[PDB]
Structure 1
Amino acid sequence: ISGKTMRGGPRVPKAAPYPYKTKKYSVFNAIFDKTSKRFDENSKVICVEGPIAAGKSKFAKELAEELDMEYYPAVDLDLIYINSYGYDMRKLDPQLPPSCRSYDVRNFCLDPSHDLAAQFQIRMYMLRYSQYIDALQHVLSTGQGVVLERSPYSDFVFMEAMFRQGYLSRGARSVYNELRQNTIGELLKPHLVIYLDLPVDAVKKQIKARNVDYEVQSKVFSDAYLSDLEQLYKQQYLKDISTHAELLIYDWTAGGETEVVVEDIERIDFNQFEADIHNKKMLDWRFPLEAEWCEARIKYCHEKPDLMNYFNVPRFDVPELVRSADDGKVWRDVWFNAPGMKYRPGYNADMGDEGLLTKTKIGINQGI
């Protein structure tokens, strides 16, 4: 929250960070090690928003660079298609054409008419949501601040946006809209939210400067679609965050001067907000006791599987969301017979793992 420049140097972690990447957290461990001890000034979440093609990745990178937080790169839909040895399951051709063949943002931009697009439309929310928990994991373990370029909280903007265009199904809009509640209740809202505001034309200027053969030549980029971002951001998405997180809105990144943004954020302090607890703003961060800190900490360092399993929602009332059994059976055959998927990561000795016959270790929230 405070810039290194006003520190005349770097920031220090108040206590030794906990190896949450490689270590499991236990309730025994909570008794054996306190949580908010590590916590410091910057222990907060600064979320970013803006109309698409706002280039905010470089902004957030520099902002986290000169305020000493984590960047946490943006959505990476490919990770579904990536594995312990990289290669793309998109490599696997339309052997199983109907609903097993891939769909990336490229495919969406080339054609949002395909019902299979709805797949990532929800899986994209999960990726955001999984990232968010990663951010909370990093906060509560290290006490260091974080900056997510985009949030699951904001994802519904694109959701209603695509549906208004007609691309998603009336069924899918209900599915995602109700399903957000199920998980979205279980996340802490960010401390601070910064939203960037260019007009639809202006972003079209920049998106034509992105020169992306799967976007710039695409056809989705109607003013209506790229404007629905504006209305939804303006009122629908902002207001609830405006209730909880402190909201700053500069014009945009390009004229957005980092240093003044640095100064404006730093000027906005929260000790002012250490008044009455019952205040609804910052509400999701008032942790009374060190024990309650540890409850939040263990709940994210030891219940990420639980967090993922909330997604298990049964809905076989939507055809595009249903899969053909026998085809799906083959889709299972392809994935787990394909190179580097037979076993757990680190145990695909067919693809190279050594040290087996004695190795019995498994990583905290290690995928499977």
Structure 2
Amino acid sequence: ISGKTMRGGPRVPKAAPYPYKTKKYSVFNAIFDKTSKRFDENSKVICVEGPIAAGKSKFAKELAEELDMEYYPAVDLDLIYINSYGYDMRKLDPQLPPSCRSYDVRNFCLDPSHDLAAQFQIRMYMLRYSQYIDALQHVLSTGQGVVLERSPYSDFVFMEAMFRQGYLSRGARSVYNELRQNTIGELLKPHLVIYLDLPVDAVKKQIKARNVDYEVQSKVFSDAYLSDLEQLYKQQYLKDISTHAELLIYDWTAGGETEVVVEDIERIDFNQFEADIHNKKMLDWRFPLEAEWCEARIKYCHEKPDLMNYFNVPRFDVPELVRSADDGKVWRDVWFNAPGMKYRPGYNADMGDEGLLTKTKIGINQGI
């Protein structure tokens, strides 16, 4: 993956980028537009990794700037608590039942032993899923690679970290394992992963480098929990990914510099895995025909409601993930009658949208 300096300037595309957010790509659109006419050496998925506090955002933004890639930060719960109109839904909690109240990252940090925190972990996985297809829509349709601050593959370690600390039961672990077995097999594993290795204590020191109140007055950021994440990462997750992705582990006790991390990438030969068609490295990203490339692009553009509807699994034995029916009706009549989500986010007259009388357009892969 050539950087900005070896290329001699900004990256030029091999063909015209497809407007994937505006034009729907389907089977009948696959004849005129072909997927592999845009792919190059820069069209790879790079996922940066690491512990709780490792400077992933600034390093990933600098890696996106130097390699001419699209930056995708880690998804937080302000994507669904704050809708497209800017109204935060964390102010609806007096009217909501206590089993249906808002629960975000700071609510996990203040109250770790809450039931809905397990739901929160499951919710976070869905949000990571909700960006990963948005990663794979960007690589396949435009031909420019992406960088991800965290991965949907990188989220079961958080589940096991809550489970070994006692914040989750066996039932929520079994539920999240069933959703992971149901959903992760439809994704393509990333091309390259960068893990920023840190000790258990130094991350805590980096907590004091952040000075936010809800992460310093909390209880979860202890010696056993961060050691549990470090053990889970380096003993299960990275060893499972290194059979597919070229793993790069750096020590980040110091500040570090993104240029040497860029310069280690071009020393990797990515064409040595194409000699064997049954090689485990880059197995999900090789396609022998142009029609298989268009088949994957159709699966990742026209079948994103398919992959989001694969989460509809029934699990009723747990009492932490089952919403009460009276509480569900009260939640519906508060949440869907709130300003900003009475209708579909295009057609909402209460938030100043004009020209609704002649408008019949809807968003492609849009949450209703």
Number of equivalenced pairs: 368
**Cα distance in 1, alignment partners of residues 65 and 58 from structure 2:** 10
Which whole-Å deviations, capped at 9, do the CAs of 1:66-85 have from their partners, x for residues lacking one? Answer: 01111111122121211121
- Cα separation, 1, equivalents of 2:51 and 2:83: 31
Give TM-score, length-normalised by structure 2.
Answer: 0.98
User: How far apart are residue 221 of structure 1 and its match?
Assistant: 0.9
**Contact kept? 1:103, 1:117, Cα under 8 Å:** yes
Mapped pair 1:290 → 2:287: no
Q: Does the 8 Å contact 2:44/2:145 carry over to 1?
A: yes
| DSSP-derived class of the 1:185 partner | helix
Stretch moving more, 245-254 or 291-300: 245-254
Cα distance per residue 1:107-145 (max 9 Å; x no partner):
101111111111111000110111111000000011101
Compute the displacement of 1:255 (Å). 4.2
Larger CA deviation: 153-162 vs 338-347 = 338-347
Equivalent-residue separation in structure 2 for 1:30 and 1:252 (angstroms): 45
Query: Distance in 2 between the 1:3 and 1:84 partners?
Result: 35
Report the 3-state secondary structure (helix = DSSP H, G, I; strand = E; otherwise coil) of the residue aligned with 1:20. coil
Coordinate RMSD, CA, aligned: 1.1
Equivalent residue of 2:47, what SS?
Answer: strand
Compared CA separation, residues 341 and 114, structure 1 to 2 (3 A): same
CA distance in structure 2 between the partners assigned to 1:193 and 1:211 by the alignment: 28
Cα deviation, residue 98, structure 1: 2.1
What is the TM-score with the length of structure 1 in the denominator? 0.98
Shift of 1:263: 0.9
| Residues 55 and 253 in structure 1, CA contact (< 8 A), matched pair in contact too | no
Structure 2: unaligned runs, 5 residues or longer: none
Contact 1:94 1:100 in 2 (8 A): no
- 2:180 partner SS: helix
Q: Partner of 1:195: helix, strand, or coil? A: strand
Q: Is the 8 A contact 2:106 2:214 kept in 1?
A: yes
Partners of 1:256 and 1:144 in 2: how far apart? 26
**Aligned residue for 2:177?**
177
1:226 maps to 226
Equivalent residues of 2:193, 2:245 under 8 A apart: yes
| Shift in Å, 1:319 | 0.7
* Structure 1 residues 321-364: Cα deviation after superposition (integer angstroms, max 9, x where no partner): 00110111010011111102111112111221111111000011
Distance 1:244 1:113 in 2: 36
Shift of 1:256: 3.2
Provide Cα deviations, 1:11-47, integer angstroms capped at 9, x if missing partner: 1011000000111112110012111001111111111
SS at match of 1:183: helix
Deviation of the 1:219 alpha carbon:
1.3
Distance 2:168 2:18 in 1: 43
- Give 1:222 shift: 1.1
Q: In the aligned structure 2, how far is the partner of 1:254 from the partner of 1:76?
A: 27
Contact 1:118–1:168 (Cα < 8 Å) also in 2: yes
Greater mean alpha carbon deviation, residues 154-163 or residues 248-257: 248-257
Q: Give 1:94 shift.
A: 3.0
| SS of residue matched to 2:118 | helix
* Structure showing the higher helix proportion among its residues: 1
Give the whole-Å Cα distance in 1 for the aligned partners of 2:48 and 2:224.
22
What CA distance in whole angstroms lies between the structure 1 residues aligned with 2:76 and 2:325? 28
Displacement after TM superposition at 1:153 (Å):
0.3
Instruction: Indicate conservation of the 8 Å contact 1:250/1:256, yes or no.
Output: no
Deviation at 1:253, TM superposition (A): 7.2
Task: Give the secondary structure class of the aligned counterpart of 1:249.
Answer: strand
1:262 matched to 2:262: yes
Q: Relative to structure 2, which stretch is displaced further, 273-282 or 135-144?
A: 273-282
SS of residue paired to 1:31: coil
Structure 1 stretch displaced more, 79-88 or 53-62 = 79-88
How far the C-alpha of 1:216 sits from its partner, in A, is 1.6
Residue 178 of structure 1: how far off its partner (Å): 2.1
Q: How far is 1:280 from its partner? A: 1.1
Note if contact 2:183-2:310 (Cα within 8 Å) is conserved in structure 1: yes
The farther-off stretch of 92-101 and 136-145 is: 92-101
- Aligned 8 A contact 2:347 2:353 in 1: yes
> How much has 1:257 moved relative to structure 2?
2.4
Q: Distance in 1 between matches of 2:169 and 2:5?
A: 50
C-alpha distance 254-12 of structure 1, shift in aligned 2 (>3 A): farther
User: Conserved in 1, the CA contact under 8 Å of 2:4 and 2:11?
Assistant: yes
Structure 1 unaligned segments of length 5 or more: list them: none
Q: Specify the SS of the correspondent of 1:247.
A: strand
Which residue of the partner structure matches residue 248 of structure 1? 248
Q: Is the 8 Å Cα contact of residues 14 and 38 (structure 2) preserved in structure 1?
A: yes
Check the 8 A contact 2:73/2:150 in 1, yes or no: no
**8 A Cα contact 2:339 2:351, kept in partner:** yes
Worse overlay, 297-306 or 1-10: 1-10
In the alignment, is the contact (CA less than 8 A) between 2:97 and 2:327 conserved in 1? no
C-alpha distance in structure 2 between counterparts of 1:38 and 1:136, whole Å: 14
Where has structure 1 moved over 3 Å in runs of 4 or more? 253-256
SS at match of 1:333: helix
- On the 8 A contact 1:59/1:253 being kept in 2, the answer is no
**Distance (whole Å) between structure 2 residues aligned to residue 155 and residue 93 of structure 1:** 27
Say if 2:2 and 2:266, in contact at 8 Å, map to a contact too. yes
Matched residues in 2 for 1:238 and 1:26: separation? 35
Shift of 1:146: 0.5
Note if contact 2:96-2:334 (Cα within 8 Å) is conserved in structure 1.
no
